[PDB]
Amino acid sequence: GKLSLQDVAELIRARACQRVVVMVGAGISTPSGIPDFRSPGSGLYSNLQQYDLPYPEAIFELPFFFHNPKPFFTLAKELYPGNYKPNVTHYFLRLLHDKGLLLRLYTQNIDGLERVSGIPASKLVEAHGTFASATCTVCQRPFPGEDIRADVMADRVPRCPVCTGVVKPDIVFFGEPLPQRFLLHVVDFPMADLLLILGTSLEVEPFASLTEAVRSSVPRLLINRDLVGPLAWHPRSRDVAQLGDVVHGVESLVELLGWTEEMRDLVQRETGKL
Amino acid sequence: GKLSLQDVAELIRARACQRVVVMVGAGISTPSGIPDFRSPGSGLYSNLQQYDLPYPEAIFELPFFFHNPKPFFTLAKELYPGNYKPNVTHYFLRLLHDKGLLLRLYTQNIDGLERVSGIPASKLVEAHGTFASATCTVCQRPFPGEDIRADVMADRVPRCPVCTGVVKPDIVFFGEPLPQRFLLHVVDFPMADLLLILGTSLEVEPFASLTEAVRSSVPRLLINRDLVGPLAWHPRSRDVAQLGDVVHGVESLVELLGWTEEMRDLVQRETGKL
Ligand SMILES: [Zn+2]
Ligand SMILES: [Zn+2]
Fold it and tell me: What are the binding positions for NAD(+) in this chain (chains A, B)?
């Protein structure tokens, strides 16, 4: 019969699970105040209103990028390292790493808050890339992210110092393949003893169908606004769904885990640079 | 001490080698009359003169493609299936396949003559893609190659029937990753007992460094205009170089192999559609 949140907490506590793979989406970054560009309200959205996008996903299409690189660079200025901080949901993942439980964190987010929260690059897979580095679109010359920062904060399109091509951050656009580290899923997912899914809608391949690559006796815990993707329509009976606000889902799990005080103290220290 | 062409012929004949991996470049297609676009002389080159390319490789760069897709489409009209035929060097590979010797054929060419010569898709790796299929650059909708043919032969840029984006043939441009089948090299190259290199200059990664992934006792035979890439500057002592015209290198190998008459008869039949 169906496990509960509490049961999952118990498995971790009894050390019956020691190898947790986590998959995260945009839902875990909302509480850091990161605006959804598709949504009116934010100043990111307003600044986008002047380009008259035919539809918002154009921001992540190459043909539209080479026609006009500024819509996308408005977004990058908004999301570039230093502007936003990790939320509790990030530090809970960090805590999970420092207690020996993290096999691998797969993120679809490009805001960079997982590494900012101090989880090591070797445990992360940024499936949609990162602003930490960039590539010249013409000569394929690689640059660290801070080399084009002055350009991005001043609203100039970054140009290549060798060939003058437009330097693009290593974010995955539509139809581009995921980065090579995404191939870890092949070892990682058969090896997982627990699967944690947080703040995602499972609408972007091939990351979506990943929920399907764990052994059938592996419990899959979803903390998300609703039931969705693989888990809604191919239910396994070790599936668990904490529906509601992601942060209140994480706070309850954290408490059932017995980690509350240690978490508060970790976040105070960490979020200290504010 | 150093093997000779003749020795390699003997290894194959004594059935001491039965698992040949082949890597090929533009050098094997010249004799079918396929023009080098970088080179004055051809009518491909003349037709390119009107676009005033800043340099010829622009034909294979995305930023230049989205700025002007016609230079590239001039090339595609030139190379589209049906216009050119395989040469003897292709049918020698085909013969090598029909005698049970081909583990895998890796090609950097995009002219399609390996499959036209009748070597099965399962034995081929088109490392630089193919005109057999295409993808809409905006909505990533896939199409067979013949769906955009009327457009390419008439000099219209092919547009997507669903979103109107420009449909691009699935050729690998600069900085794009190689196709997924390129991952076969991981099983294929440790498994090879002979490595055959034909008509290439080994100047395009990561295909170039592949010459390095065979076991050290695996003879590497080069039939090419000159000594080059890995083989020129990290010589192993089972290396062999037939320098000269690629076709005369292949004809000599074919004769040492004992296959001349069977080859002529295969080519007459095959090249029959002319
Ligand atoms: Zn450049
Ligand atoms: Zn389309």
Answer: 25-45, 108-111, 199-201, 224-226
